[PDB]
Amino acid sequence: HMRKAWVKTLALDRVSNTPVVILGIEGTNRVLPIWIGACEGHALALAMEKMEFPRPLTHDLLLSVLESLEARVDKVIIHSLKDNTFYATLVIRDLTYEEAALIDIDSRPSDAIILAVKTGAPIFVSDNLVEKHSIEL
Amino acid sequence: HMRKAWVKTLALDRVSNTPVVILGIEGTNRVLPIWIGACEGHALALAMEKMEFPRPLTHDLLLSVLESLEARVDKVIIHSLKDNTFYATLVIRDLTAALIDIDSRPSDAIILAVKTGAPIFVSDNLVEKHSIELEVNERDLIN
Numbered sequence: 001h002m003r004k005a006w007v008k009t010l011a012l013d014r015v016s017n018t019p020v021v022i023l024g025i026e027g028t029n030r031v032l033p034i035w036i037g038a039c040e041g042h043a044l045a046l047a048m049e050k051m052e053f054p055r056p057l058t059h060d061l062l063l064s065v066l067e068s069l070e071a072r073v074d075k076v077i078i079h080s081l082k083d084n085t086f087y088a089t090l091v092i093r094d095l096t097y098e099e100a101a102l103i104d105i106d107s108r109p110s111d112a113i114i115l116a117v118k119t120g121a122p123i124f125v126s127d128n129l130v131e132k133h134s135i136e137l
Numbered sequence: 138h139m140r141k142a143w144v145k146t147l148a149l150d151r152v153s154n155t156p157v158v159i160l161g162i163e164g165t166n167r168v169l170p171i172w173i174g175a176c177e178g179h180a181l182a183l184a185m186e187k188m189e190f191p192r193p194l195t196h197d198l199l200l201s202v203l204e205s206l207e208a209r210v211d212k213v214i215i216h217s218l219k220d221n222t223f224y225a226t227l228v229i230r231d232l233t234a235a236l237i238d239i240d241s242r243p244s245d246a247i248i249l250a251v252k253t254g255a256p257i258f259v260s261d262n263l264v265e266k267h268s269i270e271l272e273v274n275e276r277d278l279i280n
């Protein structure tokens with residue numbers, strides 16, 4: 001009931017001067033745009049550069065917390081939209097082990113995408129969001 | 138070892154107009170200023186305000202991950218300074234020495250302490266070498 005997606009670009013909405021994630025939807029030529037805050041966009045911009053920093057930023061520290069508790073990002077789902085807000089699930093995998101070892105966590109789309117970018121974990125978008133909110137470019 | 142601290146104040150430096158966290162060192166009249174980024178300062182402000190939001194911000198997400206994995210923030214330690222950089226430890230307690238030391242920036246660790254109520258500690262080296270002892274005249278200037 002959901003399509004694989006990826007970060008195509010992090011654009012700027014020069015009208016609202018705000019960052020816009022453009023998710024590609026696999027199986028389509030449509031994209032789903034998601035508006036995020038400035039600090040979120042900066043963190044995603046840095047994550048997508050995939051470069052080395054001498055000190056852990058917040059999402060890095062999240063990922064270190066997961067690692068320490070023998071878990072990892074399994075996937076990310078952008079599933080719902082109400083009142084201009086997309087709702088995401090960070091699906092975490094408990095590595096103490098069999099598929100019921102997945103934990104769903106409420107997340108904003110920004111945080112989820114950033115963690116998926118950092119980890120290589122898959123992003124999914126629900127059919128319904130694609131049907132109703134994906135766009136052509 | 139180390140001294141208990143609390144966030145006395147978060148403000149924009151009145152010259153560089155960037156955030157500085159003044160930590161108070163309990164049991165003293167000393168404070169430790171730590172300069173942080175614009176985004177970290179906003180996150181800390183929201184946390185200090187105990188701002189209630191419909192959606193989880195990044196630090197909230199981290200704390201829900203902790204909770205999901207049966208763990209809590211235990212305490213936070215600002216322990217070293219190297220080339221203008223403070224180094225911290227996020228100490229996590231596995232609720233299932235079940236304590237875990239995780240390297241942190243001071244910003245993140247102070248944010249997570251403020252949100253959870255976990256104690257902030259500063260090492261005696263930092264206090265001895267970097268804290269400053271305020272006179273009332275200097276506290277009034279900050280206030």
Ligand SMILES: [Cl-]
Nearest residue numbers: 036108109110
């Ligand atoms: Cl978001």
Ligand SMILES: [Cl-]
Nearest residue numbers: 173242243244
């Ligand atoms: Cl910092």
